[PDB]
């Protein structure tokens, strides 16, 4: 059992629309801090909501009595901002959150301290890398393409301000996710060195080819489903960032989902607007099903050569996403249409993959009939396109 430690109403800062919305938050002793559109009445917790290893800031801008939960999630620093009516309310909340997180560090350290099996033993610096290209900036860091001097190999390096936080063994065993190769700290930075595939950007391949056949999109979609299934069920994590720009190919033509993002909240949104799920736009409560929406948008784009929702005005784009039904090119087949309609259900509870079975729902869809999912995971499907 997981018990509620503190609960109540808070104003949640919005990223895309309303800016400040009232939500009913539960802080639980497993570390989850989750907001709901109304007092829930009653799925497995997602680590995205954990307050474990957070740092807590009080602040008076842009609103008196606001507090921030800042957390490092894998290689990305995220910040969750809230506001209450009184400075007293805020002290109750920050105190409860701290107490929960403290109790998690304590029980964990005690457990590892007890289970250490002559792992009581006691690799790199900035200088070993050549800068080549800025890949992106965020509020607390930057991502750059680097060449490792000693080997000639290319990596993406994520460089974070160390002070806002204060792993390579924790790497996921999945072929199509971005593996962390090194992690190191300087005097003022924490840097993550991660793989960089050299088969090109799928965004660029799709642009040049105009559209992918249903069979080519089925191959890429299967590799993506396999990776998201792993994240969801082995890591208890949602990706939240699936867009075409975040798909690359390796030299053999297999997919790599990239981990190059940084939050931009605090010095143009974070998520690319055309890929955002309705419940993310509305800061409604969200779960594993947000990734299946992203899969829908990306496979719509591969098989149709254009987005399912677009407008240069992002408020009209948001309204398309929330309100308009999808139309399909006249040449798309019914298995593809069935998959895409299912993935792009606006209600996460009705969306394909949104039930307790998660990715299994999608793996069983008739669009994927004949895919051997064990072969997908082992890179035994032969790629329809080999990059140069």
């Amino acid at each position, epitope marked *: 059992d997981v018990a509620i430690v503190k609960e109540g109403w808070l104003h949640k800062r919005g990223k895309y629309i309303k800016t400040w919305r009232p939500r009913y938050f539960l802080l639980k002793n497993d570390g989850t801090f989750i907001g709901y559109k109304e007092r829930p009445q009653d799925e497995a917790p997602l680590n995205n909501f954990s307050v474990a290893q957070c740092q807590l800031m009080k602040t008076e801008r842009p609103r008196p009595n606001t507090f921030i939960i800042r957390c490092l999630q894998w290689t990305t620093v995220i910040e969750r901002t809230f506001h209450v009516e009184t400075p007293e309310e805020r002290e109750e909340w920050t105190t409860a959150i701290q107490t929960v997180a403290d109790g998690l560090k304590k029980q964990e*350290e005690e457990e*590892m*301290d*007890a289970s*250490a099996e*002559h*792992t*009581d*033993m*006691e690799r790199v610096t900035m200088n070993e890398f050549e800068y080549l290209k800025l890949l992106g900036k965020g509020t607390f860091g930057k991502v750059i393409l680097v060449k490792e001097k000693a080997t000639g190999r290319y990596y993406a390096m994520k460089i974070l301000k160390k002070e806002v936080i204060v792993r390579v063994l924790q790497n996921s065993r999945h072929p199509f996710l971005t593996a962390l190769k090194y992690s190191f700290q300087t005097h003022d930075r924490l840097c993550f060195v991660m793989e960089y595939a050299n088969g090109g950007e799928l965004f660029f391949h799709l642009s040049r080819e105009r559209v992918f056949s249903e069979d080519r999109a089925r191959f890429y979609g299967a590799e993506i489903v396999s990776a998201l299934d792993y994240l969801h069920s082995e890591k208890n994590v949602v990706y939240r960032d699936l867009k075409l720009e975040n798909l690359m190919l390796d030299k053999d033509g297999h997919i790599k989902i990239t981990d190059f993002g940084l939050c931009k909240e605090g010095i143009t949104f974070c998520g690319t607007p055309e890929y955002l799920a309705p419940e993310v736009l509305e800061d409604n409560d969200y779960g594993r099903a947000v990734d299946w929406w992203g899969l829908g948008v990306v496979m719509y784009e591969m098989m149709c050569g254009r987005l399912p929702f677009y407008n240069q005005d992002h408020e009209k784009l948001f309204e398309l996403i929330l309100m308009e039904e999808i139309r399909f090119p006249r040449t798309l087949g019914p298995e593809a249409k069935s998959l895409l309609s299912g993935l792009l259900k606006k209600d996460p509870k009705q969306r394909l993959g949104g039930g307790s079975e998660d990715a299994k729902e999608i793996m069983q869809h008739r669009f994927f009939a004949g895919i051997v999912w064990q072969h997908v995971y082992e890179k035994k499907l032969s790629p329809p396109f080999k990059p140069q």
Partner: nanobody
Amino acid sequence: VQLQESGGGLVQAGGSLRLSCAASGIDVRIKTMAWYRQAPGKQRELLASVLVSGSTNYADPVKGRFTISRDNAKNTVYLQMNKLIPDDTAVYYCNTYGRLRRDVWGPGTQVTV
């Protein structure tokens, strides 16, 4: 809370010394304990560890000559050091896994052979 080493000093090669680590505010029963040493120019070296089960392991340079033991009662770990060679000269530290990964160390105790 804190770990504190004692029992070091000057000693002639082939001699013996017993190091102790008084754990004040921690519980050595609940944790893998290990001994370490570090020489002026070198990095810190794992020497020995005792599991909560009592199982011991040792690194090669010391296997046979040192023995690490845990006294649950006195909340202390020990390193019995036997037949000391010059290359044993160093400052010796005891530690838990958690403190180890956070680079938190007691004051250490100097052994000179």
